[PDB]
Subunit: 392 residues, 2 copies
């Protein structure tokens, strides 16, 4: 599943690099990514589709570190971006703009212009007012903007019953070209919505509105010669006759989640009448998923100890009730022990802040037995370098 495994010496390694070595060299907390894990997951997705025309558009928001993006860009990956910042990251990482699709409900005129100038693949439009703005901007630039409409399955996009009308509007707007349909179908409803979607592509085709690609979003869906999920399998089988509809997938978490761990150190162990607490050095500003959402992430020792385990809540170092990484974890701990939080490669560093004026941590990439720093730990004083006191 991934390359974070214990080796013969009894400790946890990332590929061929001991995690403890990285903690020593770069300090804690620390995000560590595995190049091989990212590549193995991307290829599983890329190859599961078969010869069917497709494009994997990695969801940049999941993990947008330049090293991570560069890894995927070298494989020829596409990218799904939600801002001009993400588009600039893709370009800095060597990504191909012709393989970029731009999503998001609040795209600005400035963002649309930069994307049009870079000639991205498609704008995934979520509303009629957005469609109007993209038409205005493309006209001002004297170009034609490639679009897809985000549609919602019949049960945040446009409803199925207004889809035809909004597509006809896009078709009548002078500065837009209709290219795709975006439907985040990711089991009975999935299939039912897929048919209604294909029927819509056909009816539009009769009207001279030609959809060339279908974007099915993320939340899929590789079964491991890796095969697609029953969901994807159900779709591919219905697309033999329906061609040459290029299929676009937007995996994020599926590629990046298990490719990263957060290494943290146990500062203090505290005991109450019925509970035990391990105070760790990673806080809500470093990894917010458990606090914000109700995410359960496996927490394991870099060097497991023998003996009777005690049940601990793992809590951060500041002063918040939601400052914790895990609850009710049976572990054998001593102060100073290092832990790894699995599944921290997605929605980990991307959501990190400077809350409590804490510098963001370093991000490191392993590649066999080599280690590359891909994001330096922030220098403390840089946190307020843009600020000013009152002159009074």
């Amino acid at each position: 599943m991934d390359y974070f495994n214990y080796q013969e010496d009894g400790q946890l390694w990332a590929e061929q690099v001991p995690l403890a070595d990285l903690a020593n060299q770069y300090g804690t907390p620390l995000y560590v990514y595995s190049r091989a894990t990212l590549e193995r997951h991307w290829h599983a997705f890329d190859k599961s589709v078969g010869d069917y025309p497709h494009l994997i558009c990695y969801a940049v928001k999941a993990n947008s570190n330049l090293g991570v993006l560069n890894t995927l860009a070298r494989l020829g990956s596409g990218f799904d971006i939600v801002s001009v910042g993400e588009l600039e990251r893709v370009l800095a990482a060597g990504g191909d703009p012709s393989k970029v699709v731009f999503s998001g409900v609040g795209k600005t005129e400035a963002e649309m212009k930069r994307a049009l100038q870079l000639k991205i693949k498609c704008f995934n439009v979520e509303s009629e007012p957005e469609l109007q703005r993209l038409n205005k901007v493309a006209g001002e630039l004297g170009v034609k903007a490639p679009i897809s409409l985000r549609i919602n399955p019949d049960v945040f996009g446009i409803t199925f019953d207004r889809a035809a009308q909004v597509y006809r509007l896009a078709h009548s707007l002078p500065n837009l070209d209709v290219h795709g349909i975006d439907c985040h179908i990711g089991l009975a409803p999935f299939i039912d919505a897929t048919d209604r979607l294909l029927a819509l592509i056909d009816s539009l085709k009769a009207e001279g509105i030609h959809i060339r690609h279908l974007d099915v979003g993320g939340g899929l869906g590789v079964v491991y010669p890796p095969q697609p999920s029953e969901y994807a399998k159900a779709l591919l089988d219905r697309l033999e006759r329906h061609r040459d509809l290029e299929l676009i997938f937007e995996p994020g978490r599926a590629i990046a989640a298990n490719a990263g761990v957060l290494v943290t150190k146990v500062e203090f162990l505290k005991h109450t009448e019925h509970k035990n607490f391990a105070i760790i050095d990673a806080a809500m500003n470093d990894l917010i998923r458990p606090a914000l959402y109700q995410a359960w992430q496996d927490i394991i020792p870099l060097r497991p100890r023998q003996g009777e385990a005690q049940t601990y809540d793992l809590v951060g170092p500041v002063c918040e009730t939601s400052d914790f990484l895990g609850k009710d974890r049976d572990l054998v701990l001593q102060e100073g022990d290092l832990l790894a939080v699995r599944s921290s490669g997605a929605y980990g560093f991307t959501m990190s802040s400077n809350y409590n004026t804490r510098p963001r941590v370093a991000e490191v990439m392993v590649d066999g037995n080599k280690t590359y720093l891909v994001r330096q730990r922030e220098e403390l004083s840089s946190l307020w370098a843009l600020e000013s006191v009152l002159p009074e």
Copy 2:
């Protein structure tokens, strides 16, 4: 203008021209000059609330230690330092902010359950007022660092309040098993340990007596027991000079809460304990608004897609800078992030047109302090108004700086 408008909470109010003003500066002008989204703070609002709190205790020896984490902008901190405020910090970064803002380190208390040796060393070097120690292992670490520097660390122990288990079993169980502090029954023992260590110097007790939702009677008995402990420790040679009661014991708008008054009635007999309060939201919350622009009005349910996202404000009344005449419609205000949790308000009645500017009230605390770059979005500008003057207190981040510390794979 004798009829200059105000409200009980802040200086963000409408005037003769039909628009929302921040003190004597139109919010619309600031949005025009600095862009949106924008955090706008009111100097007079911060001062009003800090003074209301400072005056509530009257003549009794005290220190207000503002909770820096609520809003640690240098301009905000400087406003308070100018009034002689103290500060409660939870990291070395917050300590450095206070120093850069002109604050007095001898009025700084350092809280937090996971202070590092490095943080303790710097805090000791700057001679802060006191370390609010949350566990025995932390007490040992501070003794170690103080021992290495050959100095005496000033300490206060965070002691859970002595709730009576017979009358408040659930609260008692909750307190005793929480991650914060040391249980009341262990207080004397851990104080004796601190007393035995020559590189520690016992100065206080940190007991957040009003933080448990409790009636006046139980609060008072619990307070009496805390005071009796202080006395028993004193007779035993361990001299506590200050009591830090934490946050929440606010003011009723301008006299103190009945809780605050009961406490004061007991402290005023001896008057040998300096009282420390740690307000944060109570000082900063209403001193700020987040100004945001409506991008699109999407109708299905109605959605006003605004330019402020979860990365800007993750936590509130939402009002127009320039109210329109018409029949208000109901909207959910949602940001641009591709997340279901990316919203600022649900079901709000407003008369809107695309491009309109809105102000999100009560955004001065836990607003910018929690802002991130999620979706590679630069953090916004922070401006402070002072009468008719405008001060830029945090520049908007330049987009390319977001990945300046990063690198690609070797070639």
